[PDB]
Design a protein that fits this description.
The structure is cut from a larger assembly and holds 9 protein chains of 9 kinds. Chain F is built from 4 helices and no strands. Chain F is mainly α. Classes of the chains: A mainly alpha, B mainly alpha, C mainly alpha, D mainly alpha, E mainly alpha, F mainly alpha, G mainly alpha, H mainly alpha, I mainly alpha. The complex binds cardiolipin (4 copies), heme-A (2 copies), 1,2-dioleoyl-sn-glycero-3-phosphoethanolamine (PEE) (2 copies), peroxide ion, copper (II) ion and potassium ion. One 1,2-dioleoyl-sn-glycero-3-phosphoethanolamine sits at the interface of chains A and C. Chain H: It comes from Perkinsus marinus (strain ATCC 50983 / TXsc).
Chain lengths: ~450, ~100, ~190, ~90, ~70, ~90, ~100, ~45, ~140
């Protein structure tokens, strides 16, 4: 059979396959954006059809996060190797594992069908009210997808937590990363469901939470209470993969295993109580802003320890071993890229600096370096490491120095200018812009078209 | 004619002599929504005692305009004129203490 | 860390000790099925986690972060004027909430604000004392600091009397320049 | 028998430095205490609101009876305590 | 868990019920039953309501009577 | 302990650190109190810290201050270099 | 039989937490000097004077607040057309006679 | 005031208020620290 | 206790790490060979040496844990155990009694007083002319 299969390793493959398929739509949406931003004036989107652009950015953000990266890093690799890293045979809850991947597909079909049938309007991937609750039915459809996706995420989190009961070996660092990510989902998802229901209530049940005398900022607190743990849920599995790749490909025992494990735990605890650095410009109390700013900076301490522990893993490795394997290059590239993304995150953590850089392309570049480069490269690196175990072929990616170099150069061309544009300044979620920002936007656009061409070379 | 006369009498007086500065009761917060509601309630009570024509209540309205946007005031003034403004309901006709 | 089960492990009395940890570690464990095996696994975990020197660094960090977290939560409820828990003031119109207004001014003047506000001149180059004077009196009059903020501020001299242009850029001098032209009052 | 109670100097918070008094537009020095009165009143706002309430209560009396001296003395004591901490910094 | 003896010190058997003859006074029987089944459940169960009841009903004196006699205006 | 490598704590204070589990708890408790104390003792206290006349002047302050005072630099530094907007056009 | 939590954990951490919250609040009030006397009344001085007049008998009983103001909204103008305080008092007087 | 072509404007440009200067100075204050963090780590990415 | 714990409250399988204290040490003892004296050099390893059923105490522990599951009569626990088993049940029952016989009477009294005096007996009477019951929990005002 193909749909009835409960084998966890098969389901892991399905997660990877589905993420690539949905990735194409996400890439298409991303390509539409940079083509439009090539220069001032409409290029592929009519001025009378600006609503479509708002939908493109809204779906680009939603699909890439919930439908592409999260299934790939939290559903794909973990379902394949996690029961193997544990001494157990298969996943604890086989039937739940089957329904989780099916749920992800159905939610994807609902989302894309809504593009085709409903009027195309957008409110951003964060769905801030009141804009989200004064829109058309496409917003209702997107909410159903998120709620449905939430069901799959929570049941998958329950599945991984049960490994603690049955694990017959040692809890490796990678296993810890998945377990702690599951803990974050369990504590953050129910809060997300509650606020999403309130959005539906206003949209569909004549609720008045998001009109005058009802604080709209209420949504931002509850949403970001899940929002920031989500970004840490995306990256923590990537950290686990990097730890395995560096140790395995260098024949070096992981240094400071317990320090690595405690760093992951510390990040989750801190990541659950710093959500309001997304709300600096709303006008919070003085003491509130100081607290979140102070605690946000503290997240760098555990994150820094992991970076240094990774570096010493690569240092001193035997020279005779060939170092040009794509998996090793991607793992090393992650350290270089993540540091850039994290440092810029610390810059925008300072709230007064953030006043100028909120809702600008500097924030875009910040999370693209971490997610579009780092997370993707970590997912690529893990899949490459498991090529023999997974057994896929008909691609030239294992030893391809051209692909690694071209990818690194061109992605940096896309997003380095966006840091510069942030100070110029160019707002986010914008289709037109002043003529004097064209040069930097043009350079990034040339970077985007180049990256897409490179992907065709792997086949 | 005293240095601390502003504070003496009322905390209200502080912004009556300095309309464009922060009110002591709401200076700690950037959000001034509660400040606008207090100012409007003060204007409503002035008219009840002194009447609209009184210059004092005219200035109280000006104080409200200093912190209340016009789109809010137009809506709230409409409710006040009809008689459905919850701020201006006479105390003996309030329902806050009823049924709990 | 002993390597023989015959040698006992020293334990203190209290709610977080070796004995306290042993009693609860194996409550949910399917692997600690007999004394010999249970002790071996218990000492294995204790050796791996509590005898790891770098682990104690994270213990300090979680304590500090949680301590700040609890204090800020508690401070808002206790002192923040805008936070209501009792209902007496919420049953009255805004002008009548006299008890709540008592929190306003003291909550507006925390110690740290007074200490650090004078150090604005480490950031602003022109007229760092533009907002120092306020005749209303809700806050103290500010006086610019005489030294740079410790740390990463190597751009400016260690003390402001070493800067030849510091006095010329003060709000007083600029006010003198513009008043001489009749340009503005400030 | 004697004017003051002696203390260690570390207990006595004598001003470290001297700030000259502000000068009026006319050119005459303004009293430091008068400049500090508005600030210290704010620091004693709680007592001031209690005094302010008393004024309104006695205002709404048909009879002439009523005084607010008790509340005023509490406010005055608080304001002066604030002044004492900072006044000598402006006095030679 | 600290092992400890059974604290019940009352009679362990009253004998066969014979039309309610040769049995203790009713109040003594109630005391024995609670001793047998544990006073800890009684105190825990009643603690919440006692605390709430005392706090609310204390206001009859603390909030109502005292306030009338203690208002400086 | 604060800013202390615990290997030093193990070495120099064996008896105190004999119970590692208890030692870990004290590490958490000690740093919890510090964080709690900072908020309520350093940040919270109202109407304090405004004695700007008592700025701390460390020995390094006086060393540099006297060095410039001895020469004319201190007088020159404090002098207002410009107090007019427009220069006179010849 | 092995115990994981405090022997009396539920009562300990419920009453104990409530006690600590109450004691902390009292300390906070002392530090800031907040008045702790409870007033259940609105503080509008003019209105309280009118209520005292009703209690003294200067103003007839059951007289509405809108009958005493210098500015009336539209809804109050509607009610004033049907207001008869004298009739209301007579009706109450009749009820008392019937009851006794 | 307004964006200009091909400008890095690293940290901001053209402040007109004392607060605007503060924003730029804060970024410049931390910028050298950011370089130190990057350079020190990257230099050790090697066998 | 309600919740199942592998270590202590293992009622699903009934496994116990140690035998009952009734048995003499000669008959059965806890599986502890930490105090075994050093093996003479001339002795040779015949068995695996692996921790498992080759050790007599572990074999007897496994055997007893299976054969204890059939017994002629109940092994009666003491009243302390029986109290703990239904601690929540007994306490909830007493909580119901407290609601009926403590809360009910004074809540009824307050409503009757409120009828006559317009406010509960534990509240300050208002002079502001507003009508209605007002607050109930006075200390939260
Ligand atoms: C009280 C009141 C009572 C009222 C009573 C009223 C009753 C009402 C009833 C209501 C319920 C009705 C449904 C009941 C279902 C019963 C299930 C059951 O028991 O089945 C046994 C039955 C056993 O079959 P069998 O009779 O033994 O014969 C099977 C074969 O002999 C060989 O066996 P097999 O299992 O191997 O074969 C199946 C499989 C074999 O074929 C293959 O697998 C082909 C090879 C793979 C090629 C690569 C595919 C791409 C990679 C995907 C990777 C991820 C996969 C994840 C796992 C699979 C998820 C489906 O082919 C398929 O079934 C199709 C596979 C589809 C894969 C989809 C992958 C993603 C596609 C992405 C699309 C991207 C474009 C976007 C736009 C379009 C969006 C739709 O199940 C099946 O095998 C068939 C299932 C068919 C039902 C599927 C329904 C899907 C609905 C989707 C939502 C559509 C809504 C929106 C429409 C939009 C259109 C545009
Ligand atoms: C005034 C108030 C006073 C109150 C006093 C209250 C006293 C309470 C006493 C509590 C005593 C606990 C006793 C049991 C200890 C654990 C034993 C255990 O689990 O046995 C394994 C047992 C399986 O039996 P087994 O066969 O022996 O397992 C063999 C191993 O798998 C094979 O592994 P292996 O042999 O290789 O390694 C052994 C060990 C290896 O691992 C260990 O040995 C870990 C040892 C450390 C654990 C943490 C201890 C506490 C540390 C101090 C924290 C203080 C914070 C203070 C804050 C104050 C703020 C005011 O493995 C495990 O422990 C596996 C389970 C780990 C679960 C972790 C879940 C995430 C929690 C966060 C991690 C802890 C971070 C601590 C802080 C870090 C920063 C300093 O696990 C299970 O039964 C699994 C059940 C899974 C259920 C999941 C769903 C639960 C519901 C979730 C709700 C949401 C949770 C949110 C969490 C948020 C986290 C950030
Ligand atoms: C002011 C007046 C008004 C007051 C209103 C109060 C309202 C309260 C609402 C409560 C709603 C009901 C909830 C409980 C329903 C069930 C009741 C029941 O059956 O009780 C009797 C029964 C008594 O059990 P027993 O075995 O007969 O005990 C006999 C003796 O009592 C002696 O037993 P033992 O001492 O020997 O121990 C055996 C027993 C002892 O356990 C119990 O008996 C449990 C009793 C609990 C009762 C509820 C009290 C309130 C608990 C508050 C907890 C707050 C968490 C922290 C929140 C932080 C927020 C920032 O152990 C178990 O049964 C194990 C259960 C599994 C525990 C799993 C915990 C997972 C979460 C761990 C923490 C995660 C955060 C880590 C952070 C640090 C990271 C480094 O309880 C159970 O069997 C219930 C267990 C199953 C339900 C567990 C639910 C766990 C939920 C975890 C949520 C974690 C969220 C984390 C994130 C939060 C922040 C984002
Ligand atoms: C000259 C002037 C003179 C002036 C003189 C003035 C005189 C003034 C006198 C003042 C006196 C003050 C006295 C202070 C010292 C107190 C000392 C003391 O004894 O403290 C400890 C004492 C009891 O603590 P303890 O010793 O730990 O208890 C022993 C236990 O047996 C421990 O044993 P355990 O732990 O085994 O206990 C049993 C436990 C065993 O646990 C288990 O079995 C394990 C499982 C536990 C977890 C359970 C999970 C959930 C269970 C699910 C089932 C739920 C069923 C109910 C469902 C309801 C559905 C609607 O289970 C339970 O207890 C829980 C289950 C039972 C049902 C729970 C029902 C829900 C509870 C939560 C809600 C509470 C709020 C309700 C509000 C109303 C309704 C909305 O604490 C208190 O009584 C609190 C102190 C209150 C102070 C109030 C002060 C203010 C009021 C002043 C009044 C007088 C003023 C008059 C005016 C004067 C003006 C001058
Ligand atoms: C995987 C995704 C991911 C990850 C890991 C992070 C990690 C971090 N993020 Fe990010 N973030 C996003 C995804 C992510 N973020 C997204 C998607 C947004 C925008 C959402 C939206 O608005 O739509 C965002 C937005 C965002 C904002 C702005 C929110 C707004 O106002 O709009 C801020 C502000 O501080 C921030 C901070 C941080 C910080 C401080 C970290 C830290 O974890 C980084 C820590 C890492 C380092 C610091 C580098 C490693 C450490 C060292 C090299 C040594 C130590 C270094 C120092 C002490 C400086 N993020
Ligand atoms: C995982 C998340 C993810 C990923 C990969 C990307 C990838 C890219 N994104 Fe981004 N983007 C977001 C998440 C992501 N993005 C979010 C959350 C926003 C904010 C939404 C909002 O404004 O509300 C955003 C916003 C955003 C904007 C701003 C829109 C606006 O405000 O007007 C732009 C503009 O160019 C952009 C461009 C790009 C480009 C050019 C790429 C890529 O082309 C970069 C290079 C990548 C490739 C060439 C493809 C490589 C292959 C994969 C990524 C799939 C791999 C799959 C597997 C391994 C299974 N993105
Ligand atoms: C959320 C509202 C719910 C109302 C519930 C009513 C029932 C009351 C009893 C249960 C709730 C506990 C609160 C009881 C309070 C009793 C005393 C009281 O009235 O306090 C009021 C006072 C403020 O009221 P006002 O005077 O109107 O505001 C002044 C300016 N801010 O309230 C408080 O300060 C207490 C409220 C918070 C109590 C909870 C504890 C706070 C700290 C939480 C820390 C959380 C982080 C983690 C802690 C870990 C600890 C191990
Ligand atoms: C039986 C199990 C019961 C478990 C119940 C768990 C309840 C809590 C679940 C999580 C939700 C937390 C509540 C949400 C708190 C939001 C507070 C908020 O947004 O307030 C901020 C201010 O809040 C703060 O100062 C931030 C404090 C951070 C609160 C975090 C609470 C939840 C933390 C959960 C982390 C995970 C658990 C950690 C456990 C210990 C780890 C060692 C807004 O301030 P302003 O808008 O400026 O308004 C101020 C006055 N106008
Ligand atoms: O979100 O960072
Ligand atoms: Cu964030
Ligand atoms: K364009």
């Amino acid at each position: 059979f193909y749909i009835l299969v409960n084998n966890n390793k098969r389901i892991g493959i399905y997660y990877i396959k589905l993420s690539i398929i949905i990735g194409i739509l996400g890439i298409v949406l991303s390509y539409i954006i940079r083509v439009e931003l090539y220069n001032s004036g409409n290029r592929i989107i009519k001025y009378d059809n600006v609503n479509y652009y708002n939908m493109v950015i809204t779906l680009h953000g939603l699909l890439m996060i919930f439908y592409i990266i999260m299934p790939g890093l939290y559903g794909g690799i973990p379902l394949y190797i996690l029961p193997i890293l544990s001494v157990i045979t298969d996943i604890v809850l086989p039937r739940i594992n089957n329904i989780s991947i099916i749920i992800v597909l159905i939610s994807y079909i609902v989302v894309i069908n809504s593009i085709v049938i409903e009027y195309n309007i957008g409110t951003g991937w964060t769905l801030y009210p009141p804009l989200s609750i004064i829109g058309t039915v496409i917003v209702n459809m997107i909410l159903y997808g998120l709620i449905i996706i939430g069901i799959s995420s929570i049941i998958s989190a329950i599945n991984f937590m049960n490994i603690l009961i049955v694990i017959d070996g040692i809890i490796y660092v990678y296993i810890w990363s998945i377990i702690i990510t599951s803990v974050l989902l369990i504590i953050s998802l129910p809060i997300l469901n509650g606020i999403l229901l309130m959005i539906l209530s206003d949209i569909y049940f004549n609720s008045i939470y998001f009109i005058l005398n009802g604080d709209v900022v209420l949504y931002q607190h509850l949403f970001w209470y899940f929002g920031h743990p989500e970004v840490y849920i995306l990256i923590l599995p990537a950290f686990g993969i990097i730890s395995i790749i560096l140790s395995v490909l260098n024949n070096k025992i992981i240094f400071g295993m317990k320090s690595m494990i405690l760093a992951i735990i510390m990040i989750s605890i801190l990541g659950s109580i710093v959500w309001a650095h997304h709300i600096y410009t709303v006008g919070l109390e003085l003491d509130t802003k100081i607290y979140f700013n102070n605690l946000t900076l503290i997240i760098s301490i555990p994150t820094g320890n992991k970076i240094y522990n990774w570096i010493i893993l690569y240092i001193g490795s035997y020279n005779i071993l060939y170092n040009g394997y794509q998996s090793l290059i991607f793992s090393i590239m992650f350290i270089i890229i993540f540091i850039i993304g994290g440092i810029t995150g610390i810059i925008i953590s300072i709230d007064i600096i953030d006043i100028g850089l909120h809702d600008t392309y500097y924030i875009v570049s910040h999370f693209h370096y971490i997610l579009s480069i780092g997370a993707v490269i970590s997912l690529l690196a893990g899949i490459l490491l498991l090529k023999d175990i997974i057994g896929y072929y008909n691609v030239i990616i294992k030893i391809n120095k051209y692909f690694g170099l071209l990818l690194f150069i061109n992605i940096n061309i896309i997003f380095t200018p966006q840091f510069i544009i942030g100070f110029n300044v160019m707002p986010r979620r914008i289709l037109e812009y002043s003529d004097n920002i064209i040069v930097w936007n043009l350079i990034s656009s040339i970077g985007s078209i180049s990256t897409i061409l490179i992907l065709l070379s792997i086949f | 004619e005293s240095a601390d006369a502003l504070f003496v009498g009322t905390l209200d007086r502080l912004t009556a002599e300095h309309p464009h500065t922060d009110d002591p009761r709401f200076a700690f917060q950037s959000n001034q929504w509660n400040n606008c509601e207090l100012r409007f309630t003060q204007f409503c009570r002035c008219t009840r005692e002194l009447g609209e024509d009184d210059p004092r209540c005219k200035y109280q309205y000006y104080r409200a305009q200093t912190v209340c946007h016009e789109f809010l005031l137009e809506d709230w003034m409409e409710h006040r004129h009809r008689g459905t403004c919850d701020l201006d309901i006479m105390p003996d006709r309030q329902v806050i203490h009823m049924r709990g | 860390p002993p390597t023989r089960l015959s040698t006992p492990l020293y334990s203190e009395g209290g709610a977080f000790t070796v004995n306290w940890w042993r009693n609860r570690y194996g409550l949910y464990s399917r692997r600690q099925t007999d004394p010999m095996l249970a002790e071996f696994l218990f000492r294995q975990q204790v050796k791996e986690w509590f005898y790891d020197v770098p682990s104690y660094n994270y213990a300090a960090l979680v304590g500090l972060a949680l301590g700040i977290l609890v204090a800020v939560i508690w401070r808002h409820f206790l002192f923040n004027p805008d936070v209501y828990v009792r209902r007496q003031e919420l049953r009255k119109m805004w002008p009548d909430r006299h008890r709540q207004f008592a929190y306003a001014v003291p909550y507006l003047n925390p110690q740290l604000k007074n200490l650090l506000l004078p150090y604005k001149n480490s950031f602003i180059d022109n007229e760092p004392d533009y907002a120092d004077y306020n005749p209303v009196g809700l806050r103290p009059q500010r006086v610019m600091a005489i030294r740079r903020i410790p740390g990463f501020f190597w751009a400016i001299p260690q003390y402001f009397f070493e800067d030849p242009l510091y006095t010329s850029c003060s709000t007083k001098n600029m006010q003198t320049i513009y008043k001489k032209l009749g340009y503005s009052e400030l | 028998a004697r004017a003051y109670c002696g203390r260690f100097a570390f207990m006595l918070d004598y001003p470290k430095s001297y700030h000259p008094p502000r000068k009026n537009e006319d050119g005459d020095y303004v009293d430091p205490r008068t400049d500090m009165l508005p600030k210290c009143a704010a620091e004693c706002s709680e007592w001031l609101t209690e005094y302010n309430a008393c004024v309104q209560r006695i205002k709404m009396r048909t009879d002439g009876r009523g005084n607010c001296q008790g509340q005023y003395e509490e406010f005055a004591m608080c304001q002066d305590h604030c002044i004492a901490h900072e006044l000598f910094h402006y006095l030679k | 868990h600290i092992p400890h003896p059974v604290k019940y010190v009352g009679p362990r058997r009253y004998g066969r019920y014979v039309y309610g003859m040769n049995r203790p006074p009713v109040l003594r029987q109630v005391k024995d039953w609670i001793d047998w089944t544990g006073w800890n459940s009684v105190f825990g169960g009643f603690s919440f309501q006692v605390a709430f009841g005392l706090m609310i009903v204390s206001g009859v004196y603390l909030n109502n009577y005292r306030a009338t006699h203690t208002l400086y205006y | 302990s604060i800013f202390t490598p615990m290997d030093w704590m193990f070495y120099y204070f064996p008896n105190y650190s004999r119970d590692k589990v208890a030692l870990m708890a004290r590490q958490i408790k000690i740093h919890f109190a510090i964080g709690f104390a900072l908020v309520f003792l350093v940040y919270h206290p109202p109407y304090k810290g405004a004695d700007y006349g008592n700025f701390h002047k460390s020995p390094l302050y006086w060393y540099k201050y006297n060095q410039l005072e001895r020469s004319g630099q201190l007088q020159e530094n404090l002098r207002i270099k410009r107090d007019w907007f427009y220069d006179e056009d010849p | 039989g092995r115990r994981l939590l405090h022997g009396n954990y539920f009562t300990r951490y419920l009453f104990g937490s409530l006690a600590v919250i109450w004691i902390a609040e009292y300390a906070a009030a002392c530090q800031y000097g907040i008045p702790r006397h409870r007033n259940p009344n609105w503080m509008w001085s003019w209105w309280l004077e009118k209520q005292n007049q009703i209690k003294n008998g200067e103003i007839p009983a059951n007289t509405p607040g809108y009958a005493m103001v210098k500015w009336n909204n539209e809804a109050e103008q509607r009610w004033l057309k049907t207001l008869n305080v004298e009739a209301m008092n007579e009706e109450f007087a009749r009820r008392r006679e019937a009851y006794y | 005031d307004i964006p200009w072509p091909a400008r890095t404007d690293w940290g901001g440009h053209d402040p007109a208020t004392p607060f605007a200067e503060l924003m730029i100075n804060t970024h410049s204050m931390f910028w050298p620290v950011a370089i130190f963090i990057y350079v020190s780590a990257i230099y050790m990415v090697k066998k | 206790k309600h919740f199942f714990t592998d270590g202590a409250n293992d009622y699903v399988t009934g496994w116990e790490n140690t035998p009952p204290l009734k048995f003499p040490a000669s008959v059965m003892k806890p599986c502890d060979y930490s105090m075994t004296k050093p093996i003479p050099k001339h002795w040779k390893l015949r068995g695996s040496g692996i921790h498992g059923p080759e050790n007599t105490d572990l074999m007897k522990l496994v055997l007893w844990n299976r054969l204890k599951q059939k017994r002629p009569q109940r092994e009666v626990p003491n009243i302390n155990y029986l109290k703990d088993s239904i601690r929540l049940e007994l306490s909830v029952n007493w909580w119901l009694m407290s609601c009926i016989f403590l809360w009910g009477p004074w809540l009824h009294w307050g409503q009757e007083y409120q009828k006559v005096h317009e406010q509960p007996p534990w509240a300050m009477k208002r002079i502001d002319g507003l009508r209605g019951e007002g607050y109930f929990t006075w200390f939260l005002e």
